[PDB]
């Protein structure tokens, strides 16, 4: 039952939005035409997959997702491309100006001329639910719409919908593909602004899935296509127990409880294996034991940090296809006497274990090899910290000039905005210290 | 004293009362269509104890399936006897309760609650006369705990003058599902404290280490602990169910077990359970290892025991070896409660065994498993660690100091007899 509605923001939030729900489709076998043959109630139901999928009486099954970007170019592409018969096409939503890689335009002046629109758009998802369970936002941290389109979203959605789950998945700055010199007063601004309004937050690096791309999938140069095929498995491993049954799944919802021990706290670390390329995955079967093991090194982590110089508070082991709870345990047993795994003195060390029966899937033409188990790891570590100390640092270079500030003001922001979000990032920072600390 | 209602609810309520309703009806007689197809008498002549009579000779648990969302019970409902429960005795919501104790006392089931007393009303008026309720429910969770400890509030406030009976799960980190359970748990304990005559304390640590260090089951699931669970709960409920002396009726056992209001929490125990004589069933009864709260009888004193042997067997060898224990380890039962150990034999045994034999015990020992549960509390709540789902359904903080203390009162007072 519990309907889920995604909202896909910007140019990295579409882009993603685009390769999760293609393989979306591929999971649920449902074609590009929106038909699925294997689902024999037409015209609706409350199937796992429908938490995700809405169904109309011709027996198409419709994304619950609205795409929303400022400029055009990159939601045209989705409205003429091979998923165009997928979505109606009011969920699919642009204009004619983009917010110029300037939270300021994506907050205040362009975002401000399509917001209403964009929230009685998602009314009309929301009005075909029954039971929702909350909504999950794509978006990137340095793009001008991503950052501040988002923020005012967030915003919004709070006040019309109350404290109904929002969830973020969103895509932290890498120099390797970064388009804009101001990404770090935007990944500040829309970190401070959005703080309050979301539930729990799963940054991407791209530096880290550009590293992975790169070493286990011996990609020359990743471009966006290869980061996302990658960040769409990711992401489909963690809303899979929302999207499918079974015995040993357990729902994100629970794995939440865990993750999230005071509000601001909110930001688990993700791990995922195996990443692996067809040539090297042939008569080569990564074993529960393996796949587990790789979930602790730090080369196969979403964000780049280092977990083995921070604290443990939780951690969730999401698995997926051919995976029994003995072999599980077998593997976590041996991870315990051998790893780096130091939890703070107030939380449980027991690991915190899913599994979803349903195989892995990939796309075609894609470069992961298709594996009959996978895993995810969701841990909350202090050691994600690291990587606001790394934005905040570039924050401070530029800021101390207030190079580029004029951008901002000129759009109507004013100087003690970034004072005031800088603080509250300055607050975080010092807020996972503080829970790393011994009790008293 | 006739009619018992019984009330599951959550995951773990309802999981484990659908094993005990397959266990009973098979004992009883009773098909998955409310048929009844035995061959003894003593099958049928307490049988209104447990179930209504319907039209064409069929007999229907009085039973009422309570929950958050519908996953459970649809599953219970597509079970082996999940046809013969009352199809208006499903009460279920549809937004679960999160883990959450708050979630089930407060908000969500609150929502719910009144319409679980309509069914609870019905059933108890076509009672020639009701004796009190059995709950089975966890502790650890939000809907079985904070919701079904709402029910046992606003039972007690409509009957209040009827016993109030519950099988309760008690959570485990090494069998845990989240990190908020010590909190769930000890904002239960204090409702149970109050407003239980008779808890059957059911430690999940204790049922997974019976079955991996006993019955050598290399990874036991829920299944295989709601195994061991319904058995012990067919065993305890015995003299409830067939013609006898002893604890016939849920008054007469609180009488006989509860010497002090609040001590009222038992640890129950099962024979046998292996990878069969007399002697032998009753030295692995009071084994500890054979009991289910996870605490060592040795570090406390007996209260009071019940002791309940099943299967054709010497009535004479029976009271030959409850009276060696007792001579034995007198030392373990308290000198001021003289003959504090009473014993009922039942002719008829359960499915697939000749004999087997039941313990229920008030041991001050039971304090083990409350002090347990308070450190883990305190450890999380010294750093107000995870409050903040609670908080968010309008608790405050004052209310886990009340249940903290509340909850070491318990423990301070089992100790006060344990030196008495
Ligand atoms: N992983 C990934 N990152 C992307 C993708 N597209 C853009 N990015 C990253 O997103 C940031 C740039 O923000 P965009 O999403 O392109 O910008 P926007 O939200 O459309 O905002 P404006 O164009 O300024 O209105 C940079 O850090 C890019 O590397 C993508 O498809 N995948
Ligand atoms: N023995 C047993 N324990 C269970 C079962 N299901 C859940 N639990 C335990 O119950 C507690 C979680 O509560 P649960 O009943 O699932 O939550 P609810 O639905 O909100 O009442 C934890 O301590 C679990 O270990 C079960 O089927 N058997
Ligand atoms: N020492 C504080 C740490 C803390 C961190 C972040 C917070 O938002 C709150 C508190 C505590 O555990 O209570
Ligand atoms: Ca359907
Ligand atoms: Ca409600
Ligand atoms: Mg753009
Ligand atoms: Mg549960």
């Given at each position: 039952m519990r309907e889920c509605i995604s909202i896909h923001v910007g140019q990295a939030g579409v882009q993603i939005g685009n390769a999760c729900w293609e393989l979306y489709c591929l999971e649920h076998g449902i074609q590009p035409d929106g038909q699925m043959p294997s689902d024999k109630t037409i015209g609706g139901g409350d199937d796992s997959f429908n938490t995700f999928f809405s169904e109309t009486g011709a027996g198409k099954h419709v994304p619950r997702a609205v795409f929303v970007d400022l400029e055009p170019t990159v939601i045209d592409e989705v409205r003429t491309g091979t998923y165009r018969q997928l979505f109606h096409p009011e969920q699919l939503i642009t204009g004619k100006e983009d917010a110029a890689n300037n939270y300021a335009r994506g907050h205040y002046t362009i975002g401000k001329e399509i917001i209403d629109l964009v929230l009685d758009r998602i009314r009309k998802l929301a009005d075909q639910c029954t039971g929702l369970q909350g909504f999950l936002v794509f978006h990137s941290f340095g793009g001008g719409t991503g950052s501040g389109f988002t923020s005012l979203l967030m915003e919004r959605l709070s006040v019309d919908y109350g404290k109904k789950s929002k969830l973020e998945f969103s895509i932290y700055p890498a120099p390797q593909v970064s388009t804009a010199v101001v990404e770090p007063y935007n990944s500040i601004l829309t970190t401070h602004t959005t703080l309050e309004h979301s539930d729990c937050a799963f940054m991407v690096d791209n530096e880290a899935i550009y590293d992975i791309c790169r070493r286990n999938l011996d990609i020359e140069r990743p471009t966006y296509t290869n980061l996302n095929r990658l960040i769409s498995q990711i992401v489909s491993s963690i809303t899979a127990s929302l999207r499918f049954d079974g015995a040993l799944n357990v729902d994100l919802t629970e794995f939440q409880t865990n993750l999230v021990p005071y509000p601001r706290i909110h930001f688990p670390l993700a791990t995922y294996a195996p990443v692996i390329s067809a040539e090297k995955a042939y008569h080569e079967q990564l074993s529960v034991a393996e796949i587990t093991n790789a979930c602790f090194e730090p080369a196969?982590?979403?964000?780049?940090?280092?977990?083995?110089?921070?604290?443990?508070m939780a951690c969730c082991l999401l698995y997926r296809g051919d995976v029994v709870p003995k072999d599980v345990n077998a593997a976590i047993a041996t991870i315990k006497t051998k790893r780096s795994i130091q939890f703070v003195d107030w939380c449980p060390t027991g690991f915190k274990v899913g599994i979803n029966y349903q195989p892995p899937t990939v796309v075609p033409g894609g470069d992961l090899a298709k594996v009959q188990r996978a895993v995810c790891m969701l841990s909350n570590t202090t050691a994600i910290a690291e990587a606001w100390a790394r934005l905040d640092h570039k924050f401070d270079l530029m800021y101390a000039k207030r190079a580029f500030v004029h951008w901002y003001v000129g759009e109507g922001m004013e100087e003690g905005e970034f004072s005031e979000a800088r603080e509250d990032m300055a607050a975080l920072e010092?807020?996972?210290?503080?829970?790393?600390?011994?009790?008293? | 004293m006739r009619?018992?209602?019984?009330?599951?609810?959550?995951?773990?309520?309802?999981?484990?009362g659908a094993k005990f309703w397959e266990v009973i009806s098979d004992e009883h007689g009773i098909d998955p269509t409310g048929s009844y197809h035995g061959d003894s008498d003593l099958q049928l002549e307490r049988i209104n104890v447990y179930y209504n009579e319907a039209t064409g000779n069929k007999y229907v648990p009085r039973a009422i399936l309570v929950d958050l969302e519908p996953g459970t019970?649809?599953?219970?409902?597509?079970?082996?006897?999940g046809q013969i429960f009352r199809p208006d005795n499903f009460v279920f919501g549809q937004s679960g309760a999160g883990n959450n104790w708050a979630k089930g006392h407060y908000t969500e089931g609150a929502e719910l609650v009144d319409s679980v007393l309509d069914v609870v009303r019905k059933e108890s008026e076509s009672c020639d006369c009701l004796q009190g309720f059995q709950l089975t429910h966890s502790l650890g969770g939000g809907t079985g705990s904070g919701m079904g400890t709402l029910l046992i509030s606003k039972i007690r406030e409509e009957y209040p003058d009827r016993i109030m009976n519950t099988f309760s799960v008690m959570p485990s980190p090494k069998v845990s599902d989240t990190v908020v359970e010590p909190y769930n748990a000890t904002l239960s304990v204090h409702q149970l404290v109050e407003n239980t005559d008779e808890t059957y304390c059911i430690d999940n640590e204790a049922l997974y280490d019976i079955c991996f260090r006993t019955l050598k089951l290399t990874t036991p699931t829920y299944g295989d602990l709601n195994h061991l669970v319904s058995a012990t709960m067919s065993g305890v409920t015995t003299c409830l169910r067939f013609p006898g002396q002893l604890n016939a009726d849920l008054r007469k056992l609180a009488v006989n077990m509860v010497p002090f209001p609040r001590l009222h929490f038992f640890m129950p125990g099962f024979a046998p359970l292996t990878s069969l004589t007399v002697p032998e069933l009753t030295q692995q009864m009071f084994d500890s290892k054979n009991m289910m709260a996870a605490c060592d009888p040795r570090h406390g004193r007996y209260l009071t025991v019940a002791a309940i042997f099943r299967g054709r067997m010497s009535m004479k060898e029976?009271?030959?070896?409850?009276?060696?224990?007792?001579?034995?380890?007198?030392?373990?039962?308290?000198?001021w409660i003289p003959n504090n150990v009473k014993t009922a034999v039942c002719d008829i045994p359960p499915r697939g065994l000749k004999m087997s034999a039941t313990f229920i015990g008030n041991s001050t020992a039971i304090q083990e498993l409350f002090k347990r549960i308070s450190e883990q509390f305190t450890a999380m709540f010294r750093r107000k660690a995870f409050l903040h789902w609670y908080t968010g359904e309008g608790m405050d903080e004052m209310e886990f100091t009340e249940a903290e203390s509340n909850?070491?009162?318990?423990?301070?007072?089992?100790?006060?007899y344990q030196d008495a």
């Open positions: 196969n982590q979403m964000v780049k940090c280092d977990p083995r110089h921070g604290k443990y010092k807020d996972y210290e503080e829970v790393g600390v011994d009790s008293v | 009619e018992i209602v019984h009330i599951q609810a959550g995951q773990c309520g309802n999981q484990i019970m649809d599953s219970v409902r597509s079970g082996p006897f029976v009271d030959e070896q409850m009276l060696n224990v007792q001579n034995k380890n007198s030392s373990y039962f308290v000198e909850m070491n009162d318990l423990v301070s007072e089992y100790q006060q």
